[PDB]
């Protein structure tokens, strides 16, 4: 249906709707901010999103070669590009630590969650248009609904514990109008099935399943090289954790190649390590196919997802778990997040103490307008959510 | 009795013919807990106490030969003075107050308790018994030989031994008869201590009294006008003849501005305090010779020392620049404790995170966090605090 190319709102511009979405995302302030989030390491959320985008287009290429039946349905290069460039747009300062703080400070006003924030930025906050954010095409928006339910569908009481305040995932109720618009050309039967729970949503569109696989592959492999050279993991820990589990993961290529992959990763030469990384990436990409979703969805973008081969899934889950155990869940990273969450909570409590007086004037004006609907807190939340770590540190110093 | 020379666990190389106390001294010097005294110096203070301590032993065994066999060897009295201050946390008394408050529902915190816990359990020289020192050395570190359950500015800690260290305290006191053990446990304050520990306490007191006094005068923290009114006048009436006679000159040698003249005044004071110590029997029907005798300073000489100690605390410690530093330190320690106990597994170092997981099977995680903070230097605690809050 051409309704998937429509937007909420030149002669020589012959680009597809998806090429225009990619250009908008590339130009947005929200995208440029991912560059902020004694060595020469510069891996950011922006570089993570470029690598996901390049894996995404490679996944599409492999499916259009092995499954021609689906060549009309698969996303174009710029559509899968657009979903990977945007997937991390909504993340707050200080990663999960920022997210926990904002969610707790919004406990009585809809909460905070990064995927919801991503939806809110592209449909409203990014000022590319006056009233519809980046004003992206409907299918692009559908590809961004990793959790296509409202947070009303998906309380903790009682120094703060991370387990107690991790947000549920979904779409803010204050963005329901833009969600209703995205789901409008769906039959009622597809619409009531899309919000079905496994609370945790179960379903997503085909374009979004591809982006999720590319994101998961990027996270799994492209963090791994610099973890090795920075010394965050030794050869011994790689053998005990990753290599042994990959030798028993059940996929024949990994069981065959792990010994040689481990020697290449610890070669000490970039031109050798990249071939291990390239082979891992390629082994994972070539193991993805589109199969039908186990729900009686009627719309083709919901009736089919891309799935990775299960034994290959175990290998990917070993890699993702490994980067989480030696790159993220280390005290050096977790203290930075604790500090960030203490910082975010300070800014919120001061700024909500008197928003008109302390907010920048343009944000103060948005706060006054929003109080006609008593949604002032969400304005403070958007403002803190769009800060970089450096901007938040500077605001905190001005206040404390 | 050999039992005193024993260690909690059992090989010595055939060519090692050192006494148990020479090996205790070597372990203490090689420990990380000792090396930390350079940051906290407390190491300088402990070397001064050690060298005063052997001075006391030498002078007693010359005036009271009946006790030559009983007095501690040089390496034993060395070990107790080198180890005495191991348990002190960052920020000194302000740190001690904050930790004890954060541990109010879990056994408290106290520096002398921490010292015992480090040498019996925490220092990883052995897998299960810390530095595994000889029993008599351990007995010498028990300035307060009761449990903190018996002895428990409002938060200053009571003094004693942690209940979580009851096993190694029982082991240390095991070769004592019932009557000695029930006499040793006699805020409440303990009354008794071993001979080795009485000599060490005198050495720590003389070193605190005089060697802190020397830098305060050069550093300008005390001028002659306040020295004359507070300490010098009080020493002219303290009842010790040596101080009443020699106070006027010493006061001019102390403000000479020449290091080698000043050393003579300090040296004369220390020797004066040192020669006025003797071994007398303890006022209790103890059977064990190490508990039946203490070293005591002659009472009038004792009053002069308390004039010296009160002057060093009133003009070097109880001054606002130092006290504000202690208020900050205690806010900083409480900050760390609240972040760390908020999520230990994510915030503690992985080795310490592991000890916390193991310790909660006995619901002893709070003591692991307290151990970790107590072992920080000021620079460590300050850098950790910045990682969590600034
Ligand atoms: Ni990602
Ligand atoms: Ni001392």
SS in 3 state form for chain A?
Answer: CHHHHCCCCCCCCCCCHHHHHHHHHHHCHHHHHHHCCCCCCCCCHHHHHHHHHHHHHHHHHHHHHHCHHHCCCCCCHHHHHHHHHHCCCCCCCCHHHHHHHHHHHCCCCCCCCHHHHHHHHHHHHCCCCCCCCCCCCHHHHHHCCCCCCECCCCCCCCCCCHHHHCCCCCECHHHHHHHHHHHCCCCHHHHHHHCCECCCECCCCHHHHHHHHHHHHHHHHHCHHHHHHCCCCCHHHHHHHHHHHHHCCCCHHHHHHHHHHHHHHCCCCHHHHHHHHHHHHHHHHCCEEEEECCCCCCCHHHHEEEEECHHHHHHHHHHHHHHHHHHHCCHHHHHHHHHHHHHHHHHHHHHCCCHHHHCCHHHHHHHHHHCCCCCHHHHHHHHHHCCCHHHHHHHHHHHC
Determine the length of chain A: 400
Picking from A394, A383, A289, A397, the residue whose alpha carbon sits closest to that of residue A98 is A383
- DSSP-based three-state secondary structure for B20: helix
Q: Is B301 in contact with B272 (CB distance < 8 Å)?
A: yes
**Residues B76, B137 contacting (CB under 8 angstroms):** yes
Verify whether the Cβ–Cβ distance B389 to A334 is below 8 Å: no
Residue B117, classed as helix, strand or coil, is: helix
Q: How many CB pairs under 8 A join A and B?
A: 36
Residues A139/A4, Cβ–Cβ less than 8 Å:
yes
Q: Which two tokens stand for residue A197?
A: 């729970």
Tell me which chain A residues have a C-beta less than 8 angstroms from the C-beta of B390. 339
User: With contacts defined as CB-CB under 8 Å, which chain A residues touch B389?
Assistant: 339, 342
CB B356 within 8 A of CB B348: yes
In this complex, is the C-beta atom of B366 within 8 Å of any C-beta atom belonging to chain A? Answer: no
- Asked if A64 contacts A100 with a C-beta cutoff of 8 angstroms, the reply is no
Block residue for tokens 């065959």: A256
Which listed ligand is nearest to B47 at the C-alpha? 2
Helix axes B241-254, B195-218, angle to 10 degrees: 40
Q: How far is residue A159's CA from residue A369's CA, in Å, rounded to a whole number?
A: 34
Judging contacts by C-beta atoms under 8 Å, the chain A residues touching residue B387 are: 335-336, 339
Query: Which one of A159, A335, A342 has the shortest CB-CB distance to B347?
Result: A335
CB neighbourhood size of A269 (10 A): 10
User: Chain A partners of B341 at a C-beta cutoff of 8 Å?
Assistant: 159
Q: Which residue of B has its CA nearest to A397?
A: B390
Report yes or no: A339 at the B interface, CB cutoff 8 Å. yes
| Cα B386-B387-B390 angle, rounded to 5 deg | 45
| Residue A335 touches partner B, C-beta closer than 8 Å | yes
CB pair distance less than 8 Å for B388 and A342:
yes
> Number of helices and strands (H, E) in chain B?
22, 2
Distance (Å) from the alpha carbon of B358 to chain A's nearest alpha carbon: 18
Rounded CA separation A355/A367 (Å): 7
Instruction: Identify the CA nearest to B194 among candidates B171, B176, B168, B208.
Output: B176
- The answer to whether B343 faces chain A, any CB pair under 8 Å, is yes
Q: Searching chain B, which residue's CA lies closest to the CA of residue A344?
A: B389
Rounded Cα distance between B251 and A191, Å, is 94
Q: Tell me if B346 and A336 make a contact (CB, 8 A cut-off).
A: no
Residue of A95, A324, A334, A345 to mutate for B, most B C-beta atoms under 10 A: A334
Is the Cβ of B346 closer than 8 Å to some Cβ of chain A?
Answer: yes
- Selection from A105, A46, A51, A47 nearest residue A343 by Cα: A105
Rounded CA separation B204/B211 (Å):
10
In angstroms, what is the span from residue B289 Cα to ligand 2's centroid? 25
Q: Which of A161, A331, A336 sits opposite B342 (nearest CB)?
A: A161
Q: What is the DSSP string of B197-266?
A: HHHHHHHHHHHHHHHHHHHHHHTTSS-HHHHIIIIIHHHHTSS-HHHHHHHHHHHHHHTSS-HHHHHHHH
Record: contact A334-B342, CB cut-off 8 A: no
Q: Is B171 helix (H, G, I), strand (E, B) or coil?
A: helix
Chain B residue with CA closest to A343: the answer is: B389
Residue B353 forms contact with A (CB below 8 Å): yes
E strand or H helix at B93? helix B92-102
> What technique was this entry resolved by?
X-ray
Q: In a mutagenesis test of the A interface, which of B334, B335, B343 is the best target, namely the one with the most A β-carbons within 10 Å?
A: B343
Q: Which residues contact B275 (CB under 8 A, 6 or more apart)?
A: B59
Asked if residue A85 lies in contact with residue A22, where contact means CB atoms within 8 angstroms, the answer is yes
**Residue B362 burial (CB < 10 Å; 0-12/13-18/19+)?**
exposed
Tell me the nearest-neighbour CA distance from B63 into chain A, angstroms. 59
Please check whether residue A330 touches B, CB under 8 A: yes
Q: Give the residue carrying structure tokens 């005390």.
A: B222
* Cα–Cα distance, A211 to A335 (Å, whole number): 30
Q: Find the CB nearest B346 among A159, A331, A342.
A: A331
Q: Both tokens of residue B30?
A: 């090689």
Q: What is the structure's resolution, reported in angstroms to one decimal?
A: 2.3
For the record, the structure tokens of B317 come out as 């410690």
Q: Using an 8 Å Cβ cutoff, are B61 and B71 in contact? A: yes
Identify which ligand lies nearest to the alpha carbon of B46: 2
What is the DSSP pairing of strand A288-292 with strand B277-281?
unpaired
Contacts of A160 in chain B (CB under 8 A): 342
Spatial neighbors of A118 by CB under 8 A, at least 6 apart, are A86, A87, A88, A89, A90, A144
Q: Does A325 touch chain B (CB under 8 A)?
A: no
Contact: A335, B387; criterion CB under 8 Å:
yes
Which chain A residue is nearest to residue B348, measuring alpha carbons? A331
């Amino acid at each position: 249906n051409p309704e998937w190319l429509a937007r909420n709102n030149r002669r020589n511009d012959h680009r597809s709707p998806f090429q225009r979405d990619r250009a908008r995302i590339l130009h947005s302030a929200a995208f440029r901010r991912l560059q902020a989030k004694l060595n020469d390491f510069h891996r950011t959320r922006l570089t993570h999103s470029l690598e996901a985008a390049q894996i995404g287009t490679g996944i599409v290429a492999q499916i259009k070669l092995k499954q021609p039946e689906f060549r009309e349905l698969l996303p174009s290069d710029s559509l899968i590009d657009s979903l990977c460039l945007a997937h991390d747009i909504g993340h707050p300062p200080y990663g999960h630590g920022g997210e926990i703080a904002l969610n707790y400070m919004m406990r009585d006003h809809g909460g905070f969650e990064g995927n919801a924030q991503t939806f809110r930025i592209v449909t409203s906050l990014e000022p590319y248009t006056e009233h519809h954010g980046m004003n992206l095409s409907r299918r692009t928006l559908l590809g961004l609904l990793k959790y296509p339910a409202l947070l009303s569908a998906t309380p903790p009481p009682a120094q703060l514990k991370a387990k107690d305040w991790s947000p549920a995932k979904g779409i803010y109720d204050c963005d329901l109008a833009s969600l209703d618009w995205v789901l409008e050309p769906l039959c009622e039967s597809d619409r009531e099935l899309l919000g079905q729970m496994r609370r945790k949503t179960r379903f997503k569109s085909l374009d979004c399943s591809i982006m999720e696989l590319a994101d998961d592959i990027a996270y799994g492999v492209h963090d791994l090289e610099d973890a090795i050279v920075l010394g965050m993991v030794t050869r011994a820990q790689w053998q005990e954790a990753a290599a042994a589990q990959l030798a028993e993961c059940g996929d024949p290529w990994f069981e065959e190649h792990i010994a040689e992959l481990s020697e290449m990763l610890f070669s000490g030469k970039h031109y050798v390590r990249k071939d291990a990384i390239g082979g891992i990436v390629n082994a994972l990409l070539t193991s993805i196919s589109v199969k039908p979703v186990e729900a009686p969805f009627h719309n083709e973008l919901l009736a089919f997802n891309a799935y990775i081969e299960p034994h290959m899934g175990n290998a990917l889950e070993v890699l993702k778990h490994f980067v989480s155990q030696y790159v993220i869940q280390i005290p050096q990273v977790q203290r930075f997040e604790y500090k960030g969450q203490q910082l975010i909570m300070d800014l919120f409590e001061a700024l909500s103490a008197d928003p008109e007086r302390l907010l920048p004037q343009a944000t103060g004006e948005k706060w006054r307008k929003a109080q006609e609907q008593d949604e002032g807190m969400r304005v403070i939340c958007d403002y803190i959510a769009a800060m970089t770590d450096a901007y938040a540190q500077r605001l905190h110093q001005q206040l404390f």
